[PDB]
Amino acid sequence: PGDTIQVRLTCKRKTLKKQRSAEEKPTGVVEWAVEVFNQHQTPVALYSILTLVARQHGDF
Amino acid sequence: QQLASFLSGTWQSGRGRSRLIHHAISGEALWEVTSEGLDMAAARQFAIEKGAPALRAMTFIERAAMLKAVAKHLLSEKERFYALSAQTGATRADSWVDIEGGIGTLFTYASLGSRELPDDTLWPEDELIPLSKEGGFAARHLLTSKSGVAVHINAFNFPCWGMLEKLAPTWLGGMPAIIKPATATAQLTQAMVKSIVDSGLVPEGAISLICGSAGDLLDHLDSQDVVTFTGSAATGQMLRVQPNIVAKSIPFTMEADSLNCCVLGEDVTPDQPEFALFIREVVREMTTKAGQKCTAIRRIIVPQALVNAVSDALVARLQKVVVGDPAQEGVKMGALVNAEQRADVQEKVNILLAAGCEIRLGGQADLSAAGAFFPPTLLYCPQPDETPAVHATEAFGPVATLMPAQNQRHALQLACAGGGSLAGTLVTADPQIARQFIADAARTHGRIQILNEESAKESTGHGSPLPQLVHGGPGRAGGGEELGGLRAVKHYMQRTAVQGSPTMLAAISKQWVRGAKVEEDRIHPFRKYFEELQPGDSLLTPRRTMTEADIVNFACLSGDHFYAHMDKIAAAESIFGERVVHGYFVLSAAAGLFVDAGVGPVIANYGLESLRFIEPVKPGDTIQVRLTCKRKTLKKQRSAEEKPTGVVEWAVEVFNQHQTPVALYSILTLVARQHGDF
Amino acid sequence: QQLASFLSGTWQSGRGRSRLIHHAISGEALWEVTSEGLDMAAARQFAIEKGAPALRAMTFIERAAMLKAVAKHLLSEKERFYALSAQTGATRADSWVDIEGGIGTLFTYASLGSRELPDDTLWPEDELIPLSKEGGFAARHLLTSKSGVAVHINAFNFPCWGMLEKLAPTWLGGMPAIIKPATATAQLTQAMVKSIVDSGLVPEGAISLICGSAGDLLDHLDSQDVVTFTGSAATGQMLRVQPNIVAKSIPFTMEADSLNCCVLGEDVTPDQPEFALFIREVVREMTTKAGQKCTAIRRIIVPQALVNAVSDALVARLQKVVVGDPAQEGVKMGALVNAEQRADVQEKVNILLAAGCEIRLGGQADLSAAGAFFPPTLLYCPQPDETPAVHATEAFGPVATLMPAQNQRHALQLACAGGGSLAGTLVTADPQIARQFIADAARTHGRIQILNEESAKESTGHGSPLPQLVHGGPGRAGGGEELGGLRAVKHYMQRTAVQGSPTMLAAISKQWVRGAKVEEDRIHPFRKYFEELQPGDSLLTPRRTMTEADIVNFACLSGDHFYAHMDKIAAAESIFGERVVHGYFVLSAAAGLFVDAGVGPVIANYGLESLRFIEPVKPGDTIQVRLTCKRKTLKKQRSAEEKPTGVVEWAVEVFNQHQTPVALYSILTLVARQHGDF
């Protein structure tokens, strides 16, 4: 308690998908690298989330 | 055939030298007007000692309901007014403006008096002006209604509208009126006054009428009287130098003739839709009421590279204008009201022709026809800045000159060279042209309409003076302002800056001020009905300690994660010093403290008047809320089924353990009434 | 010794017939004034085409900072003004009012122009007036400053105050002034004007000065000029009928002298402190500035059974007042200004003695004394209603009549029988007596001070015209109002009702209206600094679905357990139909949506302008907030260490899934600036 929390969201890996049908939305599994820290700037709870970010232009 | 003047409660008439009213479309005289021998002092005496205390005893809400009742009584029998207005030579579309705008002025002042005026005789227009550091000497401005008569002198344009745009602020501001219509078309004004008097709605003496010359009315006015004029400038300057109006220093308000510009911008090209709506607006404005309205376009300012296009569009649009009798089909323009007005128009046309030019049928007008007709006239002036007769002489009919400009800087000078105008129009699509035009040409105009494609779909027009916009320009246009919303009822009131202790100003204004004595009476003010609330009925709520968990729960619940509330580092660097409680959480916990959870007379909140957060509320800092009533201001129960209610305004004052005021504001509340009226 | 005239930027002087300024307390002539040969048309020409575009190009915030700078520069060298003001016969405590009231009026108008005026050349005073059902045509009232001069004709009472109470509303309302002071005490006025000019704070041509007769100025005035008069009634009624003022229809604001009442109530008995403060107020008012202030008490109305007590108390208090030289000790009242004023006061006292009575040393005044001395005079009138000379003839000195009344209904008629008064006073303790007094005697008075024990502690008095209260009464007092707060700068501005589309009014007024076009630019408006915000920078927030759990958590957190939100049975019988979301929770979740959680230029909120909950929000009802900028209005950074900032107002427009607006309001916000001015 009484200990601030500041989060450093940063992108890590893009790796698009291939749009297995013609109807489905084009997208890609962008992985972010979340890095929480406090007022002493030491890293508490550094982890990594996956995220299905949609694409602007499909291919198939 | 006499025209009976309504003086001292009785439809009297004159005995002596008389004028007469010609039928404008045919030529015969079917009325004759006189007011000689009428006791003019007895009219003012009866008005002041009969109708002025009967109006000044009413509240403003009752005087707004009276205007709504007169409007509903006069809207029903509106068809006996078109028969009298067809005698003026006006069409059905012009008399529709003349009647329905005059009655919509009544409905508009009713809806303004029933929303922004108190249930009282004295109207405090300010909030409060504190004049002391300790808080025992404040002052506020009271508006008390004057105790005299309002002599209105109208003209021949709008007998219905031009009376009722002066009679609704007069009655709403608590004065009896003595309307003097012009003797050219006073019969429509007598029809209006007879329809008002034969209804039992207004008190006796609260309206008078002098069909004919006044003669000895301006020589009898007390200092608590006002005079409003509308007509020519030459007569109104003779009435301003009248040796009683300057002796008693009574307010003389004058509206005169003008030279209304209509400027076309450089951004408008003939392929744009702006050009067609420009030509349509100029033609409809010049032909509505046969050009006999005070806000008619009489100077069309166009750029030099568009003069031929504007002229060839205006002539091709104006040759379709049919001048004739209004009752027969296919006729758009009506006629002028008199042959004397026809001669007075054409003698100004000849003055404009002494230095200008000609595009259409100008001075060619038959001065021998049985009917006061005048053709639509579009003049021309090739040297606009070298001809001072264009910017000084107006032809009060369908006449409107056209003159070129030079790239939006000569256009501003030609729009401002009118000596003060009454209305104007810039037709552009570029808004930075309109910024310059308002910045440099609203000094001389009174109501400017910047017209474009979005405006022209639902525009009321250039010659439609709205009942909630200021009608009146400076200089040549008189100077006096009318119809300004509630700015019109303040010409009929005296603004008295009343000083004293706040507990005295609470009893004078029948409100609560800031530090008045309070009436705490052991029960809850939200439990009282409307008829047993008094302004001063207070409430001292229990306390609530603003803890650190309160900030966190409110920032979670709302989502307001602002750095002065949820961050400890950044709030140490901010102006407060540490984390503070949310202002909206103080606003919400206040209503948590004073609102009764039960079912009571309080129906809905729906409002919050003026919130200011003075000092920050910190963690570990208690909050105590002082709910006290300020205004009552009931509603008039517009149907028979609806619940009787009134907008009670509470004055909420939060404070802390140091008793300094944090977050003082004011909420509106629709408290139900115990007993209805309608 | 010549006394110059600051015309056309040069300290000119006249060549011809000259009046001369006598020393008041001794009797010699130490200045002499003339203005013959001075080109007045060239003076107005220089003030219009040199000083008016230099004032009208400034914003209102800069024109208030100019008034604050002139106030500080004139407060610094204030000791060279008391030496000039002691030549007028005033004391130190009577010249303290004259100097510091004018300089405090300058500071007051600086504070009003900094707090309630925009960073703009134009000034939109309304919110908005919608004139259409769809929303494509609206109108709002603008206030553009006039493009002429203000001819202020002052008097001999207040050279410092009486100029500076007309000069700060003139300069704050964007006009150059041409002050014509009285030729009895023009030396203090030229000291003020020279201290203003020799500082570089005001532009050139923004002030002029004619120490002497104008003669040719009023004949050369354009229609954009305003004229303000303060003096006798008989002169100002000759200047109102001046043919150019009525021909060009220029505003003529007149302040004349009146018979100010001071009514004592029936509830006051001589054992109460009300009697003591009544006698103290009457004596201090009548002896301050030798009774020469325009708001001095000149009719003491007492009850019939208290004539002897009031008379004995006024005799026992007034005989301690010493008339003599102000510099020597033990002298309270100073002297008059001229021997002509002594002759005028004595010949008005003789007219009052043609039908009155006598209680003290009255008309005995040595007309050959070296100095304009006059003893304090208390008259009497045993028949107050049967004597029309008391209610019509003022004595402009230490003279005031005394007259009885009959039980607080004859006192109202005697207070109203003055024919309009500049100020008044009721001294009571019962507040219903004050209610009955303001309800009938505020029609004739311009400023009423209800005086009691709680007010008399920190009262400014009866003869201190406040810089934020209306100074001016009807009828005999002139009719023209002054100093009404921001009502004084509106006499120098033309009120123009600018119509058009709201996206046009947003660029005309440099604000946002209701339906203007927006500039959504992919980042957050709370991240922008001050100088990169524009009015129209919108924000379309994400949605938030209001649910039943939201109502439950907010009614739990605040404590607002009102039956339309918590109870299910009574919500089915109320006006809504079912349980609704709290209005304050819509207000709070809005700020949950649009507020940036980060550290940005937004410092504090402290404001909520005008909230109205239009339609109710139910469970299962999304909410989408439209945060858009409306005003910028920067502050002036009163120190060099303080952070530069400016009050930005955001217009918040919440709506729901049907896009109908629930809960539209406006919040103030203190956004920090990028570049300061110090």
Ligand SMILES: NC(=O)C1=CN([C@@H]2O[C@H](COP(=O)(O)OP(=O)(O)OC[C@H]3O[C@@H](n4cnc5c(N)ncnc54)[C@H](OP(=O)(O)O)[C@@H]3O)[C@@H](O)[C@H]2O)C=CC1
């Ligand atoms: N609002 C505007 O801009 C208007 C402009 N005009 C201008 O007016 C000119 C002609 O209209 P006009 O008929 O001359 O209007 P007037 O100048 O004749 O005066 C109009 C009104 O004032 C009344 N009136 C005239 N003299 C006195 C007086 N001494 N004391 C009291 N009331 C008086 C008239 O009564 P009576 O009718 O008995 O004289 C009428 O009611 C037109 O050419 C046009 O320029 C016309 C109408 C209004």
Ligand SMILES: NC(=O)C1=CN([C@@H]2O[C@H](COP(=O)(O)OP(=O)(O)OC[C@H]3O[C@@H](n4cnc5c(N)ncnc54)[C@H](OP(=O)(O)O)[C@@H]3O)[C@@H](O)[C@H]2O)C=CC1
């Ligand atoms: N505020 C008030 O209520 C005041 C009341 N008074 C009343 O005034 C009476 C006399 O004082 P007085 O000094 O004679 O007031 P004035 O009648 O002299 O008028 C005062 C001002 O008007 C100026 N003035 C006079 N004639 C003209 C003119 N024709 N054109 C332009 N300006 C002009 C005077 O300048 P000049 O000095 O050159 O005439 C002075 O600046 C007193 O008895 C008192 O009753 C006195 C002062 C103010």
